[PDB]
Design a protein around this ligand. Structure first.
Ligand code: 1B3
Ligand code: 1B3
Ligand code: ZN
Ligand code: ZN
Lengths: 398, 409
């Protein structure tokens, strides 16, 4: 099953030729995107990250300084104002360094873990575009960690732990790890590259992760661990990545006062856990075939009456569920109950609540699922409590 | 005092010459921005809006169709790829119409209320930039409501109600209102403009809102109700806006099937309640002189020790308040208690919890506020419940406080 067809069927998003690789998120697709942001934030809280927002564009001069212009030009969108050229950002790192550079920093501030849901644009050749997996405007669940050389091992380990921790929520069985080494166009000395490649290889082996080399595929600023996930046709897509950069901070004048009083340049680790939100949603859509786990489902519950005798009761339950934090809709249409059920089933709504007279009298609801399971009559507080529990726990199934 | 000074004092954001009018939101400024988004979303839910996201750029051809290119050229950033020219969006409406245009719509789908926290770029002259109040990259709390002619009155009324409901949270009740009428460069006939302008004026009159006309200040596509808020120098800033558009949907081929199976063009109401998130934060910053309401405060509570002795206790409490969802920091420094309180007062932290030996003994805290008030000792659990209630109700004022800091009484 193809996420593109499922995305159309569940009204998640669309694209058009007046904006190639530019996603229009419809309400239900945007709901998923927003839930993933909530999830990422909850994890960024426990793993102790700041969250910032950098400028959408910056002067071409700044991108020249980083090496992005010489080592990354063709991918960049540019725009002008008052005789000055700007690049629309393809990466968030330089903005993060600019924020780091505001206010004197010391060893007391490190590791400084700076996250952003960073909207990037890259002028990917139009012939390489594919659904939500490869677009031109995407959002990374990005962060840069500023740390000392002594903190590299612990911070790289932390990023690797975060990847497997987050990925366990989604239950991915195939996670293939690559270590992408020095590309033909790069910055930093060969000696820097030897150290950075070794630090990553050693981090993988310490974490017991089998990996394959991807020779020459590292970033221009540093080598990359890549966590690869697979779509329905077993095509490989880079999602998670952890990268070690001994070059950009220096190019952007980042420094801090060390514990030993020597002013030094911080090491920077770049990482994304999901990758891009768009690509990750494309992957999830295929992984679940549109049957999103309840916490991610655009609409979690639909409540239906059989006739207008139960309209008032349906409205009452809908408000009760909505106040409980459940994404719930009432379907009060003048249509046969079996017509309504089929619509919501095809829409992959996890739970459907049917109210006839028997339900009104008893204060219960007849519960069924999008897999055709019939859970029979249930008391209303118990469905609320079970739903809340499965949402809060982000349960992979139920 | 100017929000730009307060913004530096509280480490909210910065700007640089490498990116004129593009905000760098630091952690604490972004905290306020995100809390405002959560607040708007609570209202989108209650008032039954969809929430979408349209892309940053679209073909110049589309912008020419709307009338934007003719009537809005100077303000648009453009970029290109593979010999096609794109506009970075200055407004979210055309993208909302593209979403509306996917799939057949019927009268049963209306009113369709489509919200977005819409990231816009307008190439404002660099001479006109001012802090957070006039930038080049800003985020509107935007929506478009697609509705029938018969629904205009109710839907405009709903937007007006939403403005006063949201502004009431901040204590803004006597709002200056204008009705901005047809500008010299416009699309649509005189007849359409007469109707749109009357509809908005009737809505204001029906809601008992006094207003003035502002001649020639309407959008190229329709007239605008404007809700003005004022900064520290009493300069007028457009924040809320409600606009009526009988032009763009037709230009962009929007239609729905009516009750007689006939093709109809929907009316579109545009509205932003806060205006932009950036400008609204600028306004709050100045109005409150940085004393943001607890629910908005980047750091809600600071817990501090007197000596190394209470460090373990402070750390326990910081963790406890953090698990309770409160934005809390520990201050473990070897500085006098008065020194700490002055610093966190300049940082506008609502509550400061002072931990001496006697506090460690009794499992309590000595409570101080950023307004100089000594609230005595309270139980840790009591402080948590009261903070949680202050946060959940988005209360304008603090524990046992008559009047919060605000410039305009
Ligand atoms: C992790 C970052 O700090 C680092 N600067 C970085 O950008 N590394 S990266 O390997 O280039 C990277 C990380 C995460 C996502 C992507 C990416 C790139 C292009 C994409 C594209 N064209 N479409 C989509 Cl849907 N996702 C994408 C995701 C790239
Ligand atoms: C309400 C919308 O749907 C409508 N399309 C629209 O954009 N109306 S609008 O009057 O032009 C409008 C609404 C809300 C915010 C603004 C606005 C414009 C420029 C701004 C700027 N340069 N800086 C800042 Cl901080 N805020 C701004 C807010 C404009
Ligand atoms: Zn990076
Ligand atoms: Zn609009």
């Amino acid at each position: 099953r193809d996420h593109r067809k499922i995305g159309k069927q569940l009204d998640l998003y669309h694209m058009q030729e007046e904006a190639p690789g530019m996603v229009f998120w419809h309400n239900d697709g945007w709901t998923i995107f927003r839930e993933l942001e909530v999830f990422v934030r909850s994890k960024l809280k426990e793993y102790q990250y700041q969250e910032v927002k950098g400028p959408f564009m910056m002067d071409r001069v700044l991108w020249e300084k980083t090496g992005h212009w010489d080592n990354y030009k063709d991918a960049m969108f540019t725009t002008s104002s008052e005789n000055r050229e700007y690049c629309i950002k393809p990466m968030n790192c330089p903005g993060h360094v600019q924020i780091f550079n505001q206010g004197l920093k010391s060893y007391r501030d490190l590791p400084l873990r700076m996250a952003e849901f960073g909207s990037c644009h890259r002028n990917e050749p139009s012939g390489s575009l594919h659904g939500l997996m490869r677009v031109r405007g995407f959002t990374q669940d990005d962060a840069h960690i500023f740390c000392t050389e002594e903190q590299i091992r612990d911070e790289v380990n932390g990023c690797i732990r975060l990847v497997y921790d987050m990925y366990s929520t989604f239950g991915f069985e195939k996670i293939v790890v690559k270590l992408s080494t020095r590309p033909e166009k790069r910055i930093g000395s060969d000696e820097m590259w030897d150290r950075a490649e070794a630090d990553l290889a050693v981090a993988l082996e310490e974490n017991n992760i089998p990996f394959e080399y991807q020779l020459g595929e590292g970033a221009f600023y540093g080598p990359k661990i890549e966590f690869t996930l697979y779509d329905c046709l077993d095509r490989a897509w880079q999602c998670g990545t952890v990268q070690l950069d001994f070059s950009l901070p220096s190019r952007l004048s980042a420094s801090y006062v060390g514990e030993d009083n020597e002013r030094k340049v911080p090491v920077m680790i770049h990482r994304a856990i999901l990758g891009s939100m768009e690509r990750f949603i494309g992957i999830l859509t295929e992984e679940f075939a549109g049957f999103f786990p309840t916490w991610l489902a655009p609409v979690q519950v639909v409540i239906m009456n059989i006739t207008d005798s139960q309209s008032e009761y349906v409205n009452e339950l809908t408000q009760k569920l909505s106040n409980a934090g459940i994404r719930v809709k009432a379907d009060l249409r003048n249509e046969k109950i079996g017509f309504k059920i089929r619509e919501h089933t095809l829409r992959r709504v996890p739970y459907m609540l049917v109210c006839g007279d028997k339900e009104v009298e008893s204060g219960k609801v007849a519960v069924r699922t999008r897999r055709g399971k019939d859970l029979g009559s249930m008391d209303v507080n118990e469905v609320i409590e079970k739903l809340q529990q499965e949402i809060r726990s982000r349960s992979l199934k139920q």
